Amino acid sequence: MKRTFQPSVLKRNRSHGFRARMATKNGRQVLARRRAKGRARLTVSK
Amino acid sequence: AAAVRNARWA
RNA sequence: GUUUAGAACGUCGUGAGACAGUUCGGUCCCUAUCUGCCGUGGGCGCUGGAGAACUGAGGGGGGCUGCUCCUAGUACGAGAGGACCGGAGUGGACGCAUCACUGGUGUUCGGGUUGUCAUGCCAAUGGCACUGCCCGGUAGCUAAAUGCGGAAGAGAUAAGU
RNA sequence: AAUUCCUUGUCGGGUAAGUUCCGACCUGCACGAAUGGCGUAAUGAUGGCCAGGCUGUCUCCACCCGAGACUCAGUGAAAUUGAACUCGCUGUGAAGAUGCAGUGUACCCGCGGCAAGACGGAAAGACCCCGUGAACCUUUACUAUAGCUUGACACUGAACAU
RNA sequence: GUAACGGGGCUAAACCAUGCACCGAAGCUGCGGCAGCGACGCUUAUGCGUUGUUGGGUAGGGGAGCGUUCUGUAAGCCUGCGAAGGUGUGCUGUGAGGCAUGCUGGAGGUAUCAGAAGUGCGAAUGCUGACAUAAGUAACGAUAAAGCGGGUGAAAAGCCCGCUCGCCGGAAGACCAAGGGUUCCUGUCCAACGUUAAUCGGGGCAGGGUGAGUCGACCCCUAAGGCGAGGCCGAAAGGCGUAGUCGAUGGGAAACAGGUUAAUAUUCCUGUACUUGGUGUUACUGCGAAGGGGGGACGGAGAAGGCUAUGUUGGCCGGGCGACGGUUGUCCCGGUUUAAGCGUGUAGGCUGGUUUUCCAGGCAAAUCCGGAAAAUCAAGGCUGAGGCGUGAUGACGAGGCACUACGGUGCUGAAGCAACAAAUGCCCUGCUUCCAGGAAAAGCCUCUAAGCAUCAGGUAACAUCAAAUCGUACCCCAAACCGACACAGGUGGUCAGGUAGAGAAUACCAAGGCGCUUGAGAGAACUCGGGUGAAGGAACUAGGCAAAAUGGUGCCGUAACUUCGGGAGAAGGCACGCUGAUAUGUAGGUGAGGUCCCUCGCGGAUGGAGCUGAAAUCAGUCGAAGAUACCAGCUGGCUGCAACUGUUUAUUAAAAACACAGCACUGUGCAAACACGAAAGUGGACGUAUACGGUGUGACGCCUGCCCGGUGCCGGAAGGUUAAUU
RNA sequence: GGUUAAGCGACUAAGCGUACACGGUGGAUGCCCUGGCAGUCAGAGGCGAUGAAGGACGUGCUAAUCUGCGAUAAGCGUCGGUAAGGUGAUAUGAACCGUUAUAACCGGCGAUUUCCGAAUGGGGAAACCCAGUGUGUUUCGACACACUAUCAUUAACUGAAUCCAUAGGUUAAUGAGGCGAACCGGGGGAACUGAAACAUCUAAGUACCCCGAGGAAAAGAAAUCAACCGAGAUUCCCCCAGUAGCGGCGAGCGAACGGGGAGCAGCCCAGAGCCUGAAUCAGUGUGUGUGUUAGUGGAAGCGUCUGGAAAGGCGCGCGAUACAGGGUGACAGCCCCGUACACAAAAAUGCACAUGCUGUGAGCUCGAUGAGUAGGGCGGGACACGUGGUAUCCUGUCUGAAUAUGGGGGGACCAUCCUCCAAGGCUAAAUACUCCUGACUGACCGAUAGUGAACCAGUACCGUGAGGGAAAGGCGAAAAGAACCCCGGCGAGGGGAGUGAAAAAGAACCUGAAACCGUGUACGUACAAGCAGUGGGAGCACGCUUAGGCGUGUGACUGCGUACCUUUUGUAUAAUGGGUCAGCGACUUAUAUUCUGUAGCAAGGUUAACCGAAUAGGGGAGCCGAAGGGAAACCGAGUCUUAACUGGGCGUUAAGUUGCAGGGUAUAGACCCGAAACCCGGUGAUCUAGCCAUGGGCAGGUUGAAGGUUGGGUAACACUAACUGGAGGACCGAACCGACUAAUGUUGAAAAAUUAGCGGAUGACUUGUGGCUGGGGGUGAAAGGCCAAUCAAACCGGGAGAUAGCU
Numbered sequence A: 001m002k003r004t005f006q007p008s009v010l011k012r013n014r015s016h017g018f019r020a021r022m023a024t025k026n027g028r029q030v031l032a033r034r035r036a037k038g039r040a041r042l043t044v045s046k
Numbered sequence B: 001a002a003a004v005r006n007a008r009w010a
Numbered sequence C: 001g002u003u004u005a006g007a008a009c010g011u012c013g014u015g016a017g018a019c020a021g022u023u024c025g026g027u028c029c030c031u032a033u034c035u036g037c038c039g040u041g042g043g044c045g046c047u048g049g050a051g052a053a054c055u056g057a058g059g060g061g062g063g064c065u066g067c068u069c070c071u072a073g074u075a076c077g078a079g080a081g082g083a084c085c086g087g088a089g090u091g092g093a094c095g096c097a098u099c100a101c102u103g104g105u106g107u108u109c110g111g112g113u114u115g116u117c118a119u120g121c122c123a124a125u126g127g128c129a130c131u132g133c134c135c136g137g138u139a140g141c142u143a144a145a146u147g148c149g150g151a152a153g154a155g156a157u158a159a160g161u
Numbered sequence D: 001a002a003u004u005c006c007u008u009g010u011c012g013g014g015u016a017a018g019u020u021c022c023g024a025c026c027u028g029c030a031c032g033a034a035u036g037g038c039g040u041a042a043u044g045a046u047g048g049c050c051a052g053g054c055u056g057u058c059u060c061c062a063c064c065c066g067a068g069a070c071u072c073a074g075u076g077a078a079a080u081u082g083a084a085c086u087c088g089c090u091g092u093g094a095a096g097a098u099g100c101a102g103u104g105u106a107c108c109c110g111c112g113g114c115a116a117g118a119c120g121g122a123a124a125g126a127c128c129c130c131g132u133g134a135a136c137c138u139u140u141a142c143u144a145u146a147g148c149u150u151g152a153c154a155c156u157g158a159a160c161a162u
Numbered sequence E: 001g002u003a004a005c006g007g008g009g010c011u012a013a014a015c016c017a018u019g020c021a022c023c024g025a026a027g028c029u030g031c032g033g034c035a036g037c038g039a040c041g042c043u044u045a046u047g048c049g050u051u052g053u054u055g056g057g058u059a060g061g062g063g064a065g066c067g068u069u070c071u072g073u074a075a076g077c078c079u080g081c082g083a084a085g086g087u088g089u090g091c092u093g094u095g096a097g098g099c100a101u102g103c104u105g106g107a108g109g110u111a112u113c114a115g116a117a118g119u120g121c122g123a124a125u126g127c128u129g130a131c132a133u134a135a136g137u138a139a140c141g142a143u144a145a146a147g148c149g150g151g152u153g154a155a156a157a158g159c160c161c162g163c164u165c166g167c168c169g170g171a172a173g174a175c176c177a178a179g180g181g182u183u184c185c186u187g188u189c190c191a192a193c194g195u196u197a198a199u200c201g202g203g204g205c206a207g208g209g210u211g212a213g214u215c216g217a218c219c220c221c222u223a224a225g226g227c228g229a230g231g232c233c234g235a236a237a238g239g240c241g242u243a244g245u246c247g248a249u250g251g252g253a254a255a256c257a258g259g260u261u262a263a264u265a266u267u268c269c270u271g272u273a274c275u276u277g278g279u280g281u282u283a284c285u286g287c288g289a290a291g292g293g294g295g296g297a298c299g300g301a302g303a304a305g306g307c308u309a310u311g312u313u314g315g316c317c318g319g320g321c322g323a324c325g326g327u328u329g330u331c332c333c334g335g336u337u338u339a340a341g342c343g344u345g346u347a348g349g350c351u352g353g354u355u356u357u358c359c360a361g362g363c364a365a366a367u368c369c370g371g372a373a374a375a376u377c378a379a380g381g382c383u384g385a386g387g388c389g390u391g392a393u394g395a396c397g398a399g400g401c402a403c404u405a406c407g408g409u410g411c412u413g414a415a416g417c418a419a420c421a422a423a424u425g426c427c428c429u430g431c432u433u434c435c436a437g438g439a440a441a442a443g444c445c446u447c448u449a450a451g452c453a454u455c456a457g458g459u460a461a462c463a464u465c466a467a468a469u470c471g472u473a474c475c476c477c478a479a480a481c482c483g484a485c486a487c488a489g490g491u492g493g494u495c496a497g498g499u500a501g502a503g504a505a506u507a508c509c510a511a512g513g514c515g516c517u518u519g520a521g522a523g524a525a526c527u528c529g530g531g532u533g534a535a536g537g538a539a540c541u542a543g544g545c546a547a548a549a550u551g552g553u554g555c556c557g558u559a560a561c562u563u564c565g566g567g568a569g570a571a572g573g574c575a576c577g578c579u580g581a582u583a584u585g586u587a588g589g590u591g592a593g594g595u596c597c598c599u600c601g602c603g604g605a606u607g608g609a610g611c612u613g614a615a616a617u618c619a620g621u622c623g624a625a626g627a628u629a630c631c632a633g634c635u636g637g638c639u640g641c642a643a644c645u646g647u648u649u650a651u652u653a654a655a656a657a658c659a660c661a662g663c664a665c666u667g668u669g670c671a672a673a674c675a676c677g678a679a680a681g682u683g684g685a686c687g688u689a690u691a692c693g694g695u696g697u698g699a700c701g702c703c704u705g706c707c708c709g710g711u712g713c714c715g716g717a718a719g720g721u722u723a724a725u726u
Numbered sequence F: 001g002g003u004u005a006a007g008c009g010a011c012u013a014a015g016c017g018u019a020c021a022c023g024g025u026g027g028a029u030g031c032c033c034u035g036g037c038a039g040u041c042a043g044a045g046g047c048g049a050u051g052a053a054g055g056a057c058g059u060g061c062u063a064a065u066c067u068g069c070g071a072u073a074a075g076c077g078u079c080g081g082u083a084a085g086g087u088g089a090u091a092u093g094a095a096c097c098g099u100u101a102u103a104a105c106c107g108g109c110g111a112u113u114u115c116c117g118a119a120u121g122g123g124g125a126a127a128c129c130c131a132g133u134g135u136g137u138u139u140c141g142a143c144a145c146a147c148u149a150u151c152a153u154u155a156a157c158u159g160a161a162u163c164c165a166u167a168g169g170u171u172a173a174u175g176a177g178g179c180g181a182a183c184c185g186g187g188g189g190a191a192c193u194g195a196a197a198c199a200u201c202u203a204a205g206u207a208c209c210c211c212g213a214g215g216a217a218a219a220g221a222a223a224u225c226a227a228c229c230g231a232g233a234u235u236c237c238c239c240c241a242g243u244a245g246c247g248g249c250g251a252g253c254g255a256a257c258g259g260g261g262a263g264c265a266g267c268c269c270a271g272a273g274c275c276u277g278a279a280u281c282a283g284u285g286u287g288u289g290u291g292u293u294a295g296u297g298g299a300a301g302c303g304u305c306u307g308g309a310a311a312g313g314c315g316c317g318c319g320a321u322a323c324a325g326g327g328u329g330a331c332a333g334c335c336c337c338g339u340a341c342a343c344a345a346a347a348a349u350g351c352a353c354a355u356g357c358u359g360u361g362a363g364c365u366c367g368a369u370g371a372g373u374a375g376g377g378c379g380g381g382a383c384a385c386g387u388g389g390u391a392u393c394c395u396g397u398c399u400g401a402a403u404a405u406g407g408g409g410g411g412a413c414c415a416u417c418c419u420c421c422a423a424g425g426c427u428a429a430a431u432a433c434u435c436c437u438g439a440c441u442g443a444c445c446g447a448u449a450g451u452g453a454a455c456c457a458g459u460a461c462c463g464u465g466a467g468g469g470a471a472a473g474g475c476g477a478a479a480a481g482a483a484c485c486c487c488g489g490c491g492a493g494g495g496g497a498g499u500g501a502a503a504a505a506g507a508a509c510c511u512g513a514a515a516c517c518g519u520g521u522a523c524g525u526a527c528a529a530g531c532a533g534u535g536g537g538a539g540c541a542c543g544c545u546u547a548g549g550c551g552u553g554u555g556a557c558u559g560c561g562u563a564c565c566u567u568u569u570g571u572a573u574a575a576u577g578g579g580u581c582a583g584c585g586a587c588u589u590a591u592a593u594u595c596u597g598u599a600g601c602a603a604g605g606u607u608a609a610c611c612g613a614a615u616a617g618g619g620g621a622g623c624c625g626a627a628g629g630g631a632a633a634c635c636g637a638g639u640c641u642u643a644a645c646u647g648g649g650c651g652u653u654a655a656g657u658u659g660c661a662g663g664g665u666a667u668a669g670a671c672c673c674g675a676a677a678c679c680c681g682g683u684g685a686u687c688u689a690g691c692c693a694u695g696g697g698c699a700g701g702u703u704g705a706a707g708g709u710u711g712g713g714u715a716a717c718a719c720u721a722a723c724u725g726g727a728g729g730a731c732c733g734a735a736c737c738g739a740c741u742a743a744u745g746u747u748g749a750a751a752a753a754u755u756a757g758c759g760g761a762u763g764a765c766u767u768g769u770g771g772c773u774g775g776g777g778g779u780g781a782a783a784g785g786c787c788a789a790u791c792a793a794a795c796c797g798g799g800a801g802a803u804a805g806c807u
């Protein structure tokens, strides 16, 4: 039965990618929080 | 989780 | 049925809604540890060991009944009617055993047949299609099939004589 | 009558027997005309009722074929659990006892089964009530408010007519 | 289950009345011990034969202590002659405790008196970790099915090989996209992983493997949409949006066949092609846009016709003479394959064609497009399957002989045709028809402006360069993706064999791929999935739930009612196999040779061979049964509700609910009402009352009566009342 | 003696119980710290277009990762320091480089510094794609550099409608872009909560969002206060004082004057001269002084004992401006590193003083004296002050002066009197904070603690995403990490051997507890009923004793005896809690106040900030007490009440105050755990709903509308017949889609499916790939449905330890 997750690399990068996040300050604040937290992977982009 | 069984009375 | 969330009627309420008013629809989970119960074993005991056949303390099962016939168309009754007591026969329900008979089943027996595949091919067979679909059917199991059972007799009694 | 409480109203039809169904009656507790009324072919995994066929649905279950259940080998959970040397009865007792009293019964221990009890397991009860709890929703509850609308002033000046 | 003496039992072992005994409590008294308190004797912060008396206890109040970690005491003391810690034992205090010791351990520990607290745990469905219980119980994941021999190995039901059996075969096969990311191949290993074992594996480990001018991506082009210079708007942030710039799921240049690896291939190799640019040479020469025009370029449904894929049969080639009757035969088996490209332009589709002339149009211009006229031609042009030829004296090819590591390698290699059937593929982006009226842009073609017209540039022919970069293994309806699992689930596209059949249904098979990662026995109850059933036939049950039954084609026949369409497949009935005949293989379809005609070809007309091939009738024949299996409607009658197809509570409700066409009311004059937005703006709508929004009703038929008091709405404005302001 | 009879009769343990012994599992306890926690004293408070922060990919003798570094890639140059050893770590090895100064290492200064990222040539799904221009190369295929973002400012050149102009346009210069902890200023700005409800109010101008800046920021040089005396910018601390006041006068909020301290600093414009470059400030060089960024020297012990090892014991010394610490085989002043002291800089740089240039103007005189402003009306806000009688401040709105002969303020207002001069600016110090650097400290933690992280931790892992977020330390002194032999599958595992003090330290490694699970021994147990114990007690076993019998284990048999906690009038209760063990887990802290105890002083007691070599001392600013009464003025051992009290009320004999400890109260989370919710900022339409764009799919078999043709009929129709036609949210039925019934399954094969049937199946169909709508919002053929397994208000983070009269 179809579940909530249907993988799509193009959709995934357009939704949460580095350029999508950095386009707005609110997403840029996510990067600031993840940089402050010390995340190994800042964004979802490979 | 669960869904409160309805075997209850009135 | 009642008893959620859907919906509708009547009714109440400005309304959301409400009504032991009504209508339609609407998830019933648990692999048994213990007690209990039904079966079936292991261990040990019972004073040498072992193999049998018993006694029965105790416990359980079973305990129903109709209708005809004879007594007797007698007792009783004006008649209409019609027995007690006692003795036969034949059923119902229930229970037990059994498969000789009557049947069921008998995907392990035999045959018929459809489609297709294979055995080189024909013929003859086999596979698969619910046992392909069917027709029969041994033993066994089985009831609807057929045998049997309920008692009589004692003891002590209930109410009552 | 999806609307009738009394009520299974009354009558008729259907059945051996019909609180349902169908037809009427009107006594409409508490129908009613676009919050539509009455009819209506067709349509409907639509509701109710009836008939034929059909059958193990049932009288009343029997047999057979498979998959489990059972035995062996291997792997190997779970919910639950205060501790247990965890019997019946009658009575008592936070008022329904394996555990108290009295009394009866019962050698020790598995296996296959059945679920009567352990107020069995599941989930800090959804019903009821409570808290000067929560939330949504309603309105002619309260207090506001967006919006809409009214006028004054400002943006905004100059003739004429009443 | 006696159950109304606790029971036994009792005729006193009951009751009544007198006694004298005895039993009976943590009460009382003895004999010790501890503590509190009161007034004393001496002495008294201490204490004394003190003495008297008190000492059940929750909430709670008061008082006094133990122990733990840390600081001072402590650069002390204890300690490798065994510290802490742990584990025993002994002693001791009213208690929390203390002391000492045996063993363990192997380096710290700490008196005393003070000081400070993360200072004392059984509970909180407490938290974390560990370990039980049920329990060696349930389960080991679709009932598609396995069996044997051999091999490897320490070991084989599970691995490998071989021979059988069974399952899928519109899939359980093949190829992809998406997604995964090495799972691919080889070697090696069996701890863990695999619901068992495992020599095996999608496990561990080590190597190897993905080769492109043509396939994709990238690239050019745009859709929805995103971003957005300036700009507009907004407390700030920001919002909207122009020019622009992104964004495929769409539009744009080109490759096919054969061979080859353990794993890659339209990528490598062989053979044969094609395309777009760059450069150079040569010839002929008007070029040219951020411009114009054309083109690209487009629906649904339906109807055929022409084809191919493909299949069948025959022919041909090769092989077979049959494990058991027959089988030299009209017998049996197998093969009978060849692309892109190039040439031809066919069936067919579309369009009249060719000049000259004029013109306020196509933002300017235009020779182009669009217009106006005139002339002349009976044609011309465009598009397009397929076939044929070439590609191809090649490749492929059954098989053959030699070698060899079961592989293989090398050599050779026959026929390689026809008829028929036939698509959902192609012609077809066609044709016909309908209303709901069916992208864009660029590449491409053409036209001229400005700017060059010796040049440049354009056209044509050769030669030549260049075609980068990234993806390419493998899975891809699943054990590799989404579901926590090697999960009875989900997941888009392409391919579509034989027999029967209308069919992609269904059954049996081919190619191909599998038997689903625990088995072996037993053959109880009971449960699940099924089979059959005497007699009755809904008596069952809320209810014919379920099951059983019906089921096909042809023909006959078919009611009430109806909106005339229906109802209707109404109901109901008849015929179905096989063989022969009509007619040895028919009607029909297809159609060669041959013979005429051609302004000549992929031609036309005859012609009928050969193939393919129903349907009907008659006769015969078998069985209980001929739509024999699978497959495949139960029917009728009354009635409520909703007109109907549809929609809905993903995961207990599919309905009478919602929607619905229709109807009516009302708002709305377009800078519309309204809605989203502090606003700009956007939607409404690039629409204009024959429109749009809101509301209610809910096809159709017949109809929709009375009330404006209340509450709303609309209109009026004289009067009463009334804000800011003055 | 034999044979019978009767009575009694131990010995059995499948197993089990208790005790003990020996193990297994497990990792508690103890010990340990290259990790944390809280501070002290300093420094440093930014980085970035000269390309940051943060990454991606590379880079070694390198397979991976870590740490460095960037194609010059664990590095290169130079200048110093230092050097006999050295090529970072896991982590050996290999191949080498050095050894008296070009090994290596450290520091200063440079060079290089791929790709992404403000990212800046364009684009983009970050680490990728695609260019343009120009210079220079040539092998004629190409190649190498450089430049090309936007905005602001400035200057040139050009350049509309439109004649000039202006807008606009093109260049060229500068500057800005981003990141970063807290502190600061400003623009916006909650709710939970408290009020035992709840509107004003509180929470709170807090949380949060946004803008901007600095090492501090801000504020700041009186149109200020005072009160008839005076003070003299701002900021900060202690008082004043929980006072005056504010307030559904409730909850609560809460000054100022004045005083004590820290630190002090004043100027410029609103204009012209006379003087003149004056003072001062800013640039820069130039030295000095003092730092910073590498370093150098640095005292003094032997013997003996125990022991694997001495730093321990026992002897006898020595140094100390060094007995701070660390390490070394057990506890080291003299073994080592250091420490106390004494020194050091080629180069860079801070700070301070001096000095030289470049600006900069000092002084004097005469003027001038901040207008849509003050004020006012209206509406709000800020002042402790909520409109109140409300001054003062800010202004959305509407008005509107005086102007030194004048204005502002003195808490309504007026007069008088004091005080000051707004409508222009600048200004150090005292103050706040710590991402970061260095040193040091702790009655702070010691692996369930301390940061989430002592370990390759913001990792593994979870989630679409925002976001959430772990577990996991210890062999020994030295790996000496067990050669060799044996069993086993050329295994695993084990037995020997060997190493070591010890393997009773063997890598599943310090110590090794408990639950739990085993082996052995003793005793008990197979006719026996129940919280499993207790009192009594035989027998057996065993240890002492000598026969006194005790001690230990077990325990037949027997009297009595229904767990614990919580909550209750009341529980064996069949009421709640708990499978067990171990670890952790709840009345604290700060301030204020009262009371008690105790100590000190005493009609007095005591300081706070601050100063201070500083727990001393100074500082008495203040606070409490010694006098009260009254609303108050006032009076006073009295006073008030009243006209007045013989009165009556309250007072007058009675020691307090400051510490420490403790009992209460108050504000903070206030003993701990637990809500459903409210508010704020973000993340989600890869699921689902709707919509948009672009593609795809729907085997087969029926019914046969309109229309058309040909007849028949009509004057023509109409009408009628036949044949063509192929209409439909048409029919039957696969794919596909739906999900009506039943069974199964219900700790599933599956957190919604399977099997057999069922509905639709050319359409209001279905589907792929993209896109759009976001939380009081979406979307919804409408069920309160759906919006990532969550919906009558999603998810994540924050307010937040909301609140919880309840358990």
Ligand SMILES: [Mg+2]
Pocket: none
């Ligand atoms: Mg019901």
Ligand SMILES: [Mg+2]
Pocket: none
């Ligand atoms: Mg059910």
Ligand SMILES: [Mg+2]
Pocket: none
């Ligand atoms: Mg049940």
Ligand SMILES: [Mg+2]
Pocket: C099
């Ligand atoms: Mg027989």
Ligand SMILES: [Mg+2]
Pocket: C106
């Ligand atoms: Mg049979």
Ligand SMILES: [Mg+2]
Pocket: none
């Ligand atoms: Mg054959």
Ligand SMILES: [Mg+2]
Pocket: none
């Ligand atoms: Mg079969």
Ligand SMILES: [Mg+2]
Pocket: C137
């Ligand atoms: Mg028979």
Ligand SMILES: [Mg+2]
Pocket: none
């Ligand atoms: Mg008798």
Ligand SMILES: [Mg+2]
Pocket: C155
């Ligand atoms: Mg007798």
Ligand SMILES: [Mg+2]
Pocket: C160
């Ligand atoms: Mg009698």
Ligand SMILES: [Mg+2]
Pocket: none
């Ligand atoms: Mg009724």
Ligand SMILES: [Mg+2]
Pocket: none
């Ligand atoms: Mg009747």
Ligand SMILES: [Mg+2]
Pocket: none
């Ligand atoms: Mg009726």
Ligand SMILES: [Mg+2]
Pocket: none
């Ligand atoms: Mg009505």
Ligand SMILES: [Mg+2]
Pocket: D034, D036
């Ligand atoms: Mg009406």
